[PDB]
Design a protein around this ligand. Structure first.
Ligand SMILES: Nc1ncnc2c1ncn2[C@@H]1O[C@H](COP(=O)(O)OP(=O)(O)O)[C@@H](O)[C@H]1O
Lengths: 757, 272
C-alpha cells in the first residue's frame, strides 16, 4: 500500500494558515518534494495570444501589426495585475485575477469583433451602396445638391471607420478590456485610471488608436437604454455601464450591493424567487430551475457557500441564474472571482442627488411632475421622431434600390424629409424650454438634493466608526419624503426652499442621535458640518488634515508649548509666528484668561475673523494648535454658528412619545451600557397605556422554541414580548426577520422589544 | 551499480568524482542560501542526497544505448547530463525567484567544471550551455503506433531526449484522447514551454515508487488542472473528498479504506 499510494497535495502560498500548518506537522513538508509555480511571464502570454489570434485572424489582416497586437495584449494583462495591487493598497478592498478571465476576454474580443465587424461592415457595404448610387447617378447624368450631406455621409463615414479601421480594432480592444476586467472598481479607477493606462500603453506601443472613448455610444442602441429606464434603470452614466456589463454576460454575475439597485432591476428587467436558506431550496428549487428554467434568484450571499451551490454552477438549455450579495466590502475568495463576474453598485452621491430630485419633485407638488413627465414624454417621442426621420432617409435611399430618379414622387419624399426636420425644430425649441424652466424648477430643489446626498454620505461612514450604526437608504428616503410632507409648503416657494434646508437637516440629525452613544454625540455633528462644507465652501482636505493632525523663536512659552509652535509653524500660519506673534504685549493675559476664544478675541487677524466665510475654521485651527485644552466647547461653538445653535441643545426621549413611532411591524432595539436598563420603565408603560403585563423570554441555550411559541401567542392575541440578552444566542436572530413579515399576518397592537450588547 | 557494464575504462574515476561532487555541491548550497520567514522552507538535510541518487539509479543498460541518438554523445556525456538534470530537479526547483535559480545553475556549472577536468570544453560546448539539454520523459519517446489495438505495446519508459516539437504534438494527441475519455472534460489547456515543464515535473514525482510532492502556487496556476492529465497518463486512479452538508470525519476514513484496498488487496495504482 505504501508502494502504490501517491499523495498529491496542492496548497495556497498566501493567507494565514499555510505556514503554521506546515510547522504543526513536520512530515508534510519533510517527505514530499516541493515545487513553485511563478506567475506567467510575458513570453507565455504572447504565446497564448498568438495561439488564440491565429485561429481568430480571419478579418484582422495586417502584417507587422499583429505581433505588436499580441505584445500589447500581454502588456494589458501585466498591467491589470498592478492596478489590482494599487486598489488593495489604498482602499483595503480585495481584488484578484486568473488566466481564465484572460481567456474569456479573448472570447469576448473574437465574438464581439466578428459581430461588429460584420454588422458595421454591412453598414459600410451600405456606404459603398451610397457610392454606387453616386456613380449610377453621375454616369446616367435637381437632387445632386440635395444629397450633399447624404453623399458626404456615404463617403466620409466609411472612409473614417475604414482608414481608422486598425484604430477601430484598437477601440474594440479597449472596449473589451474595460468590459472583461474593470467590473469591480470605483469611479476614480473605473474610467480615468484604466483609460489613461490603456492609451499610454497604445502610445508607447505606437500602434494606432482613435481619440475619444464614447464606450456606451457605439455599443448599445439607445432604444434599449430607454426601455430599461422604464424598467427602473437609473438614468445616469454609472448605471449605464453597469447595465452593459450585465448584458455582456460573459459569466453568471455577483453584485456588491450596498443599496439594492441590481435586485430591483432584475426584479423588473425581464422577470416582471427562492432564498438560499431553505431545506426545499437545496433539493426542490434546484431541480425545477435546472430542468425547466425558472431562473432561481438568490439574495443572501455572505461569503459562505453551501458547497452544493458550486458544482451546479459549473442541463436545461433554457436556464440562467443571477445571484447577489448584500453587505458591502466583500471578502470573496480568489476562486469565487475566477468563476463569476463582479460588479459594484456602490451608489455615488452624483446619481443620488438626481434620485432625490425626482422624489422631491414628486412630493412637493404633483403638478410639477405632470409638467415634467408630459414634456419629457413629448421630447423622448421627438427623439424617436428624429429616429423616424432617419428611417425615412434610409427608405428614400434603399427601398427602391434603383430607379430612384424615375420616381418623381421622390420630390415629395424630399419635401417630406424637410417636414420632419420642422417638428425637430419645435423639439429644438422645447430643449430650451426644458433646459431653463424645468431646470429652474429643479434649481429651486437641486441645492436641496445636494444637501440630501451630503447627509447620506455622512451617515454612511459612522457605520465604519462602529458597527450597529447601520441603516438603509430606504429609511432615509421615508424620512426625506416625510420632511417634505411635514413642513414644506406654506407659500413663497423660494422661502420654503430655505425652510427645507432648515428642517430636513434637523429631522435626520435627531433620528440618528436616537441611536448614538455619548462619546460619539459630538463627533457625528462635527462630520456633518465638514461634509456640508466640502462642496460649497470647498474646504481643502489638506486643511482638514491640518485641523486633525500637526522652538527657536519664542522663549517664554513652554516646551509643551514649543512643540505646538513647531506644529503650527510647519497660508499665513507660516507668516505670522514672527515679531507679530512674539510681541508679548497683551496676549500673555490672553493665554492666561480662561475661555480664550470668546471675550479676549485674538486681534492677530481681526479682519479675517470678521469675514467669517472661513474665519471660523481659521479661529479653530488656531484654537486647537495653541490650546487643545478647550477644543470641545469651541467645537460646540462653531457647530452652533455654521449649523445653528439648535443642534447644541439637550434632548431627552419621551418613552411615551417614542411608543407612537413603533408600529406593530417594527421592533425596538436597545443598545445599553453597564448599570442602566429601561426594563422597569417599559413595564410601567405597558401597565399604563396597555392594560396587561408583558411576557418575557431571556436568551440563552434551549430557548428558541419557547420564544417562538410565545411569539405565536402574541401574534394571535396582540400582547407584548420582551426578549433579553440577544448578545449571545444569535442563531435565533436571523429567524426573527423572516417572522416579522407581511406574509404571516399579525393581530394589531402587537409590539416587540429587543435588547442586546 | 558499477560492476555491470565494466566498460568504464576512465568513467569509474569520474563516477567516484560525482559521488564527491554531489557532496561538494551539497556543502556549498546548504551553506550559502538560507531560510528567512519569507523563505522559511529553504531547509536542507541529507534526504536530498538520497533523492539525488534515487533518481540516478535507473537504466541498468538503457544508458549504454547511446547508439540510436549519438548526437555528438560519448557514453559519459549522457551520464553527466543525467547528473545535471537530476541535481536541477532535486535542488533547482523549490526556490522563489528566478535569480536564485540562476545562481544554483552557476554553482552546478562551476562544480561540473571542477570535477570534469578532462573533457571540460566538451561539456561547455554541449550541456553546460544554457540551451535546452536532455529533457527526460517516459511516454513521449516511444509511440504505441496502434498496430492492431490502440495500446499496442507499453511504451519504453526509462528515458527520452531533448526536443520540443514532438513533445507538443504528442501532448496535443493526448489532449484529444483525454477529451474523448472524459465526458464534459471541458479543458481548454494551453500548452506553452513552462506548462510542459510543469507536467514533466508532476510526472517525475507521481511515477516514482514511494514518492509525493507538495505543489505551491496561487490559484489559476493550473496545478489542479495539470494533475488530471498527469494521473491519466500514469494509469493512476484519482478521487477527491466531498464535504457534505454536515462536515465530519467518516468520509475520510471510508475513502482511505477504499484507497488502500485499491492499492492493497487489488494492488492497483492510485493517487490522492
Ligand atoms: N494553462 C491554462 N490555460 C488556460 N486556463 C487555465 C490554465 N490553467 C488553469 N486555467 C483555468 O483556471 C481554472 C482553475 O484551474 P486550477 O487547476 O484550479 O488552477 P489552480 O490549481 O492554480 O487553482 C481552470 O478551470 C481553467 O479555466
Amino acid at each position: 500500500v505504501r508502494d502504490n499510494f501517491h499523495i498529491m497535495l496542492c496548497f495556497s502560498p498566501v493567507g494565514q494558515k499555510f505556514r503554521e500548518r506546515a510547522r504543526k506537522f513536520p512530515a508534510l513538508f519533510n517527505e514530499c518534494t516541493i515545487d513553485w509555480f511563478l506567475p506567467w511571464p510575458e513570453e507565455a502570454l504572447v504565446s497564448v495570444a498568438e495561439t488564440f489570434i491565429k485561429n481568430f485572424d480571419k478579418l484582422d489582416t495586417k502584417e507587422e501589426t499583429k505581433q505588436e497586437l499580441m505584445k500589447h495584449m500581454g502588456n494589458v494583462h501585466l498591467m491589470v495585475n498592478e492596478i489590482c495591487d494599487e486598489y488593495y493598497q489604498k482602499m483595503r478592498r480585495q481584488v484578484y485575477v486568473t488566466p481564465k478571465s484572460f481567456l474569456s476576454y479573448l472570447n469576448s474580443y473574437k465574438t464581439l469583433y466578428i459581430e461588429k465587424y460584420d454588422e458595421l461592415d454591412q453598414q459600410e457595404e451600405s456606404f459603398k451602396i451610397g457610392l454606387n448610387k453616386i456613380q449610377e447617378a453621375t454616369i446616367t447624368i435637381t437632387l445632386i445638391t440635395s444629397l450633399s450631406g447624404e453623399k458626404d455621409r456615404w463617403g466620409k463615414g466609411a472612409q473614417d471607420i475604414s482608414d481608422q479601421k486598425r484604430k477601430l480594432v484598437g477601440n474594440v480592444s479597449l472596449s473589451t478590456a474595460f468590459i472583461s476586467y474593470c467590473g469591480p472598481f470605483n469611479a476614480e479607477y473605473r474610467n480615468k485610471l484604466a483609460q489613461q493606462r490603456f492609451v499610454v500603453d497604445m502610445k508607447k506601443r505606437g500602434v494606432p488608436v482613435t481619440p475619444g472613448l464614447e464606450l456606451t455610444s457605439f455599443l448599445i442602441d439607445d432604444a434599449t437604454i430607454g426601455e430599461w429606464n422604464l424598467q427602473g434603470l437609473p438614468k445616469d452614466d454609472l448605471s449605464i455601464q453597469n447595465g452593459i456589463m450585465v448584458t455582456n454576460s460573459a459569466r453568471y454575475p455577483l453584485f456588491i450591493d450596498p443599496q439594492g439597485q441590481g435586485q430591483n432591476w432584475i426584479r423588473n428587467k425581464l422577470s416582471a424567487i427562492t432564498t438560499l436558506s431553505h431545506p426545499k431550496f437545496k433539493d426542490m428549487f434546484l431541480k425545477y430551475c435546472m430542468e425547466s428554467g425558472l431562473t432561481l434568484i438568490v439574495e443572501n450571499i455572505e461569503n459562505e457557500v453551501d458547497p452544493m451551490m458550486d458544482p451546479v454552477l459549473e442541463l436545461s438549455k433554457e436556464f440562467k441564474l443571477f445571484m447577489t450579495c448584500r453587505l458591502a466590502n466583500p471578502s470573496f475568495s480568489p476562486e469565487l472571482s475566477a468563476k463569476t463576474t463582479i460588479i459594484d453598485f456602490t451608489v455615488t452621491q452624483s446619481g443620488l442627488e438626481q434620485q432625490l430630485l425626482g422624489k422631491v419633485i414628486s412630493k412637493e407638488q404633483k403638478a410639477l411632475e405632470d409638467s415634467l413627465n408630459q414634456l419629457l414624454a413629448d421630447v423622448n417621442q421627438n427623439q424617436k421622431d428624429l429616429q423616424r426621420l432617419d428611417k425615412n432617409l434610409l427608405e428614400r435611399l434603399i427601398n427602391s434600390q434603383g430607379n430612384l430618379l424615375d420616381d418623381t414622387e421622390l420630390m415629395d419624399v424630399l419635401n417630406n424629409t424637410k417636414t420632419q426636420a420642422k417638428e425637430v425644430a419645435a423639439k429644438l425649441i422645447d430643449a430650451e424650454i426644458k433646459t431653463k424652466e424645468i431646470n429652474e424648477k429643479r434649481e429651486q430643489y437641486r441645492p436641496v438634493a445636494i444637501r440630501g446626498s451630503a447627509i447620506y454620505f455622512t451617515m454612511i461612514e459612522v457605520s465604519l466608526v462602529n458597527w450597529m450604526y447601520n441603516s438603509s437608504l430606504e429609511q432615509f428616503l421615508k424620512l426625506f419624503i416625510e420632511s417634505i410632507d411635514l413642513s414644506e409648503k406654506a407659500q413663497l416657494p423660494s422661502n420654503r426652499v430655505k425652510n427645507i434646508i432648515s428642517f430636513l437637516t434637523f429631522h435626520v440629525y435627531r433620528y440618528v442621535n436616537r441611536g448614538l452613544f455619548e462619546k460619539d454625540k459630538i463627533t457625528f455633528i462635527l462630520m456633518m458640518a465638514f461634509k456640508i462644507l466640502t462642496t460649497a465652501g470647498t474646504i481643502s482636505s489638506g486643511d482638514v488634515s491640518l485641523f486633525l493632525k500637526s522652538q527657536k523663536q519664542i522663549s517664554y512659552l513652554e516646551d509643551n508649548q514649543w512643540l505646538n509652535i513647531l506644529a503650527l509653524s510647519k497660508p499665513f500660519f507660516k507668516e505670522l509666528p514672527d515679531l507679530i506673534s512674539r510681541s508679548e504685549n497683551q496676549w500673555r493675559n490672553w493665554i492666561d484668561k480662561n475661555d480664550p476664544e470668546n471675550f479676549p478675541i485674538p486681534d492677530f487677524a481681526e479682519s479675517i475673523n470678521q469675514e467669517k466665510e472661513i474665519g471660523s475654521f481659521i479661529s479653530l485651527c488656531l484654537v486647537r494648535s495653541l490650546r487643545n485644552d478647550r477644543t470641545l466647547i469651541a467645537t460646540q461653538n462653531f457647530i452652533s454658528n455654521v449649523l445653528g445653535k439648535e443642534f447644541t441643545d439637550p434632548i431627552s426621549y419621551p418613552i411615551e412619545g417614542i411608543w407612537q413611532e413603533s408600529s406593530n411591524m417594527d421592533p425596538v432595539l436597545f443598545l445599553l451600557s453597564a448599570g442602566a436598563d429601561p426594563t422597569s420603565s417599559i413595564d410601567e408603560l405597558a401597565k399604563k397605556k396597555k392594560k396587561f403585563p408583558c411576557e418575557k423570554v431571556s436568551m440563552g441555550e434551549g430557548q428558541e422554541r419557547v420564544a417562538r411559541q410565545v411569539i405565536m401567542k402574541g401574534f394571535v392575541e396582540g400582547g407584548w414580548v420582551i426578549l433579553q440578552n440577544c448578545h449571545l444566542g444569535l442563531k435565533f436572530m436571523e429567524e426573527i426577520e423572516t417572522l416579522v413579515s407581511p406574509i404571516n399576518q399579525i393581530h394589531e397592537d402587537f409590539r416587540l422589544w429587543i435588547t442586546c450588547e | 551499480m558499477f560492476k555491470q557494464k565494466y566498460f568504464s575504462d576512465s568513467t569509474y574515476k569520474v563516477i567516484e568524482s560525482l559521488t564527491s561532487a554531489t557532496i561538494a555541491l551539497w556543502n556549498k548550497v546548504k551553506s550559502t542560501m538560507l531560510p528567512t520567514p519569507a523563505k522559511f522552507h529553504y531547509v536542507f538535510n541529507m534526504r536530498e542526497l538520497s533523492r539525488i541518487f534515487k533518481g540516478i539509479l535507473t537504466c541498468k543498460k538503457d544508458t549504454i544505448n547511446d547508439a540510436p541518438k549519438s548526437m555528438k554523445i560519448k557514453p559519459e556525456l549522457f551520464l553527466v547530463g543525467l547528473w545535471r538534470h537530476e541535481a536541477e530537479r532535486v535542488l533547482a526547483d523549490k526556490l522563489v525567484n528566478n535569480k536564485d535559480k540562476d545562481t544554483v545553475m552557476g554553482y552546478i556549472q562551476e562544480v561540473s567544471l571542477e570535477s570534469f577536468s578532462q573533457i571540460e570544453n566538451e561539456i561547455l560546448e554541449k550541456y553546460s550551455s544554457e540551451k535546452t539539454f536532455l529533457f527526460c520523459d517516459f511516454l513521449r519517446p516511444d509511440v504505441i503506433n496502434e498496430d492492431g489495438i490502440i495500446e499496442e505495446e507499453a511504451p519504453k519508459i526509462y528515458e527520452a531526449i531533448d526536443s520540443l516539437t514532438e513533445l507538443r504534438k504528442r501532448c496535443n494527441f493526448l489532449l484529444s484522447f483525454y477529451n474523448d475519455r472524459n465526458p464534459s472534460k471541458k479543458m481548454p489547456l494551453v500548452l506553452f514551454d513552462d506548462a510542459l515543464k510543469h507536467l514533466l515535473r508532476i510526472s517525475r514525482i507521481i511515477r516514482q515508487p514511494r514518492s509525493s510532492g507538495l505543489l505551491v502556487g496561487v490559484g489559476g496556476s493550473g496545478k489542479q488542472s495539470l494533475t488530471r492529465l498527469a494521473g491519466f497518463i500514469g494509469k493512476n486512479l484519482i478521487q477527491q473528498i466531498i464535504v457534505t452538508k454536515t462536515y465530519s470525519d467518516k468520509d475520510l476514513k471510508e475513502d482511505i479504506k477504499k484507497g488502500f484496498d485499491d492499492a492493497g488487496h487489488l494492488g492497483k495504482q492510485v493517487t490522492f
